[PDB]
mmCIF file of all heavy atoms in Angstrom:
data_model
loop_
_atom_site.group_PDB
_atom_site.id
_atom_site.type_symbol
_atom_site.label_atom_id
_atom_site.label_comp_id
_atom_site.label_asym_id
_atom_site.label_seq_id
_atom_site.Cartn_x
_atom_site.Cartn_y
_atom_site.Cartn_z
ATOM 1 N N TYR E 24 0.943 -17.964 33.266
ATOM 2 C CA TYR E 24 1.095 -18.563 34.640
ATOM 3 C C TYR E 24 -0.135 -17.982 35.452
ATOM 4 O O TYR E 24 -0.024 -16.888 35.952
ATOM 5 C CB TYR E 24 2.443 -18.185 35.186
ATOM 6 C CG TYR E 24 2.665 -18.688 36.665
ATOM 7 C CD1 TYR E 24 1.918 -19.721 37.190
ATOM 8 C CD2 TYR E 24 3.585 -18.050 37.403
ATOM 9 C CE1 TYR E 24 2.174 -20.133 38.510
ATOM 10 C CE2 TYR E 24 3.900 -18.517 38.715
ATOM 11 C CZ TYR E 24 3.151 -19.500 39.233
ATOM 12 O OH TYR E 24 3.426 -19.944 40.520
ATOM 13 N N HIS E 61 23.229 -32.117 53.012
ATOM 14 C CA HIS E 61 23.478 -31.840 51.570
ATOM 15 C C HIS E 61 23.310 -33.185 50.672
ATOM 16 O O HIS E 61 23.512 -33.119 49.508
ATOM 17 C CB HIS E 61 24.934 -31.353 51.417
ATOM 18 C CG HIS E 61 25.934 -32.325 51.872
ATOM 19 N ND1 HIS E 61 26.901 -32.842 51.100
ATOM 20 C CD2 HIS E 61 26.049 -32.989 53.066
ATOM 21 C CE1 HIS E 61 27.657 -33.712 51.743
ATOM 22 N NE2 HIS E 61 27.120 -33.801 52.928
ATOM 23 N N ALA E 213 31.285 -36.545 37.465
ATOM 24 C CA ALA E 213 30.641 -37.739 37.811
ATOM 25 C C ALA E 213 31.514 -38.743 38.596
ATOM 26 O O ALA E 213 32.749 -38.646 38.427
ATOM 27 C CB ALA E 213 30.135 -38.453 36.543
#
Side-chain angles (χ1 to χ4, degrees):
Chain E
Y24 176 22
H61 61 122

